[PDB]
Every structure is written in C-alpha cells, then in structure tokens.
A paper describes a structure:
SOX proteins are a family of transcription factors (TFs) that play critical functions in sex determination, neurogenesis, and chondrocyte differentiation, as well as cardiac, vascular, and lymphatic development. There are 20 SOX family members in humans, each sharing a 79-residue L-shaped high mobility group (HMG)-box domain that is responsible for DNA binding. The L-shaped HMG-box comprises three α-helices: α1 and α2 that form one arm of the L (major wing), and α3 that forms the other arm of the L (minor wing). Here, we show that all SOX family members, except group H, interact with RNA.
Author numbering: 335 to 405
The structure:
Amino acid sequence: GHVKRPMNAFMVWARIHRPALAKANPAANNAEISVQLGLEWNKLSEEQKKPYYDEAQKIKEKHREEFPGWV
C-alpha cells in the first residue's frame, strides 16, 4: 500500500550495511541511522542497486514456495 518495490531492495542493502554504520556512528540513534542508510542508498546508481533488487526478487520467490501452487 504505502510500501513500494524499492523498499524491499533497500531493506536488503540495509540488512547488510546497518550494523557497521551503527557502530561507526554510535552517537546516532536507530532513526537517524535509518535516515543515513536512505541517503546512502539514493546515491547508488541504478546499476549498483540492481543486485539488491535481484536479491529481493529471489527472497520473494523463496517466500512464495510456502504457497499452494508451488510445484
């Protein structure tokens, strides 16, 4: 609804990068770290974002293995 396809790719990128960013900027709280992750994500080129979108799609497909109709 409010969530669009970029968010799932961004969340892959964030899961990878948040822990080290939090430790490197430990005076910042989680909400501020989240803002910094979003700015870093938006500086990536379309080509750089591609593998995160590709991985988000693989994750989606793996989730759909739970559904009736898988195999």
